[PDB]
Design a protein around this motif. Structure first.
Motif, mmCIF file in Angstrom:
data_model
loop_
_atom_site.group_PDB
_atom_site.id
_atom_site.type_symbol
_atom_site.label_atom_id
_atom_site.label_comp_id
_atom_site.label_asym_id
_atom_site.label_seq_id
_atom_site.Cartn_x
_atom_site.Cartn_y
_atom_site.Cartn_z
ATOM 1 N N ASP A 299 13.971 8.128 -9.174
ATOM 2 C CA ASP A 299 14.415 8.088 -10.562
ATOM 3 C C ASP A 299 14.405 6.657 -11.139
ATOM 4 O OD1 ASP A 299 14.952 10.908 -10.586
ATOM 5 O OD2 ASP A 299 16.734 10.474 -9.395
ATOM 6 N N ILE A 300 13.332 5.917 -10.866
ATOM 7 C CA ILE A 300 13.248 4.537 -11.303
ATOM 8 C C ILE A 300 12.844 4.553 -12.809
ATOM 9 C CG2 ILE A 300 12.214 2.197 -10.917
ATOM 10 C CD1 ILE A 300 11.626 3.114 -7.916
ATOM 11 N N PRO A 301 13.630 3.877 -13.688
ATOM 12 C CA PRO A 301 13.261 3.825 -15.112
ATOM 13 C C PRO A 301 11.849 3.280 -15.334
ATOM 14 C CG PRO A 301 15.441 2.841 -14.791
ATOM 15 C CD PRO A 301 14.870 3.134 -13.410
ATOM 16 N N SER A 302 11.195 3.741 -16.405
ATOM 17 C CA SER A 302 9.809 3.366 -16.703
ATOM 18 C C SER A 302 9.595 1.865 -16.728
ATOM 19 C CB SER A 302 9.365 3.952 -18.052
ATOM 20 O OG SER A 302 9.302 5.365 -17.987
ATOM 21 N N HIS A 303 10.576 1.145 -17.260
ATOM 22 C CA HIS A 303 10.469 -0.305 -17.439
ATOM 23 C C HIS A 303 10.637 -1.118 -16.144
ATOM 24 C CE1 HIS A 303 14.899 0.120 -17.857
ATOM 25 N NE2 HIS A 303 14.894 -1.100 -17.340
ATOM 26 N N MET A 304 10.898 -0.444 -15.039
ATOM 27 C CA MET A 304 10.969 -1.084 -13.739
ATOM 28 C C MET A 304 9.839 -0.533 -12.843
ATOM 29 S SD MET A 304 15.215 -0.801 -13.437
ATOM 30 C CE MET A 304 15.347 -1.535 -11.716
ATOM 31 N N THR A 305 9.256 -1.397 -12.026
ATOM 32 C CA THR A 305 8.167 -1.024 -11.155
ATOM 33 C C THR A 305 8.531 -1.369 -9.715
ATOM 34 O OG1 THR A 305 6.481 -1.482 -12.870
ATOM 35 C CG2 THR A 305 5.710 -1.371 -10.529
ATOM 36 N N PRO A 306 8.374 -0.405 -8.778
ATOM 37 C CA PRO A 306 8.507 -0.812 -7.359
ATOM 38 C C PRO A 306 7.270 -1.629 -6.958
ATOM 39 C CG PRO A 306 7.827 1.496 -7.519
ATOM 40 C CD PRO A 306 8.047 1.033 -8.930
ATOM 41 N N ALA B 2 0.847 -1.202 0.000
ATOM 42 C CA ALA B 2 0.000 0.000 0.000
ATOM 43 C C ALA B 2 0.885 1.256 0.000
ATOM 44 C CB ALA B 2 -0.989 0.005 1.199
ATOM 45 N N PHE B 3 1.343 1.648 -1.190
ATOM 46 C CA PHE B 3 2.142 2.845 -1.376
ATOM 47 C C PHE B 3 1.971 3.370 -2.785
ATOM 48 C CE2 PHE B 3 5.814 1.333 -3.857
ATOM 49 C CZ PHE B 3 5.753 -0.049 -3.638
ATOM 50 N N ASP B 4 2.294 4.648 -2.966
ATOM 51 C CA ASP B 4 2.114 5.348 -4.242
ATOM 52 C C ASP B 4 3.324 4.967 -5.121
ATOM 53 O OD1 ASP B 4 2.108 7.130 -6.366
ATOM 54 O OD2 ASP B 4 1.308 8.821 -5.132
ATOM 55 N N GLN B 5 3.128 3.996 -5.988
ATOM 56 C CA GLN B 5 4.255 3.454 -6.784
ATOM 57 C C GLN B 5 4.848 4.490 -7.746
ATOM 58 O OE1 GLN B 5 1.524 0.198 -7.868
ATOM 59 N NE2 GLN B 5 3.414 -1.084 -7.923
ATOM 60 N N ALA B 6 3.972 5.239 -8.409
ATOM 61 C CA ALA B 6 4.443 6.254 -9.344
ATOM 62 C C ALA B 6 5.244 7.347 -8.634
ATOM 63 C CB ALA B 6 3.273 6.819 -10.200
ATOM 64 N N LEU B 7 4.838 7.711 -7.422
ATOM 65 C CA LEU B 7 5.578 8.663 -6.622
ATOM 66 C C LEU B 7 6.960 8.105 -6.225
ATOM 67 C CD1 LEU B 7 5.970 11.328 -5.273
ATOM 68 C CD2 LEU B 7 4.580 10.495 -3.317
#
Ligand SMILES: Cc1cc2nc3c(=O)[nH]c(=O)nc-3n(C[C@H](O)[C@H](O)[C@H](O)COP(=O)(O)O)c2cc1C
Ligand SMILES: Cc1cc2nc3c(=O)[nH]c(=O)nc-3n(C[C@H](O)[C@H](O)[C@H](O)COP(=O)(O)O)c2cc1C
Lengths: 176, 175
Positions: free
Chosen positions: A136-143, A125-130
């Motif tokens: 500075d996480i590259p678009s192709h990687m997701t937290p 439960a966290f704001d992944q895009a934030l």
């Protein structure tokens, strides 16, 4: 493994989610063991489509905090942000194994922390895009998930009594 | 236990096992594996999984067409882990089915290992055909299968153990 050791009674069942921590610093060697457990986890095709972003210095912890609205979250001494790499993960259907594979690594890391006498909670439960913007996480990687960990406060009991569905509810033999 | 180490003495002794002997898997061992799945944690403790055990000949034969890998029909026991999209915790446009079912799968893989059994986590199977064969409701997906039994001790691992280095997979504070 030891003659009398039972994975369920002696290890799995003694782990409850811990959200309240004391100030004791986590030993370097214990953090490194947790990370090693993640590194050695299995994955589809052994592609290891993960990356572990450790946040434990004050600046980073403060930066991460706004990603959560759960009051306990900013109290964890260490966060391990598990990133899933869509470009590296095995494909199935129209998706990939990022959620599966990262979750095996997270499970290994959670269990390793428990084995070393630390408390932790798995956080989704966290704001992944934030999170991606801040770090500075590259678009192709997701937290995908964050392991929040430290020495638990021994005066704080588990949040609620242990509860799970019955074995009769969750198991079918041969046919549903 | 005093110098029992989760990494050296437990995780690292597990390799995927794809070749099995005839020895029957004890009922008590199967039940322990399933118990390990049941007690796994999950987002919001919603436990959005169901474990479909396939070990009788009719079922094993019916499942076989879902896999294209030659070793797959040799496994004595399959645990098909279903994920329930209705019950799983929600985030954005998705849900925790793949996350949660994978925690349960990991617990069952590790439980099997602790009980002297070999297994392989399988995601390369025909999920649509599996749903048809086993009449799986549309809101549930067969995510993973744990293929398990007693391993053939004369067969080595499929390839040498290899992982990326710790420096490749870890960053401190910034990427
Ligand atoms: C999510 C996942 C899916 C996998 N799917 C398959 C599969 O469909 N067939 C197969 O032969 N092995 C499969 N494997 C086994 C992997 O190839 C194996 O875990 C990886 O090569 C690491 O080797 P090890 O388990 O022996 O350490 C899968 C493993 C994971 C974790
Ligand atoms: C995938 C996953 C995501 C979770 N996300 C959160 C979270 O965002 N915040 C939180 O407080 N607990 C979270 N939890 C912890 C669960 O609430 C907890 O594991 C569950 O209630 C079972 O309790 P137990 O871990 O003490 O057995 C998460 C657990 C999992 C497995």
């Amino acid at each position: 493994i030891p003659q009398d050791f039972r994975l369920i009674e002696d290890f799995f069942r003694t782990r409850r989610s811990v959200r309240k921590f004391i100030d004791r610093p986590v030993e370097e060697e214990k953090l490194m063991a947790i990370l090693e457990a993640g590194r050695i986890a299995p994955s589809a095709h052994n592609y290891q489509p993960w990356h572990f972003l450790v946040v434990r210095e004050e600046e980073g912890r403060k930066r991460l905090a706004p990603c959560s609205q759960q009051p306990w979250f900013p109290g964890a001494p260490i966060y391990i942000i598990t990133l899933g790499d869509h470009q590296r993960a095995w494909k199935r259907g129209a998706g990939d194994s990022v959620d599966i594979d990262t979750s095996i690594a997270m499970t290994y890391m959670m269990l390793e922390a428990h084995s070393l006498g630390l408390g932790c909670t798995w956080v989704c439960a966290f704001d992944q895009a934030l999170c991606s913007e801040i770090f500075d996480i590259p678009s192709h990687m997701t937290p995908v998930s964050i392991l929040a960990l430290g020495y638990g406060d021994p005066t704080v009991p588990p949040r609620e009594a242990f509860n799970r569905k019955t074995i009769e509810e969750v198991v079918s033999f041969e046919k549903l």
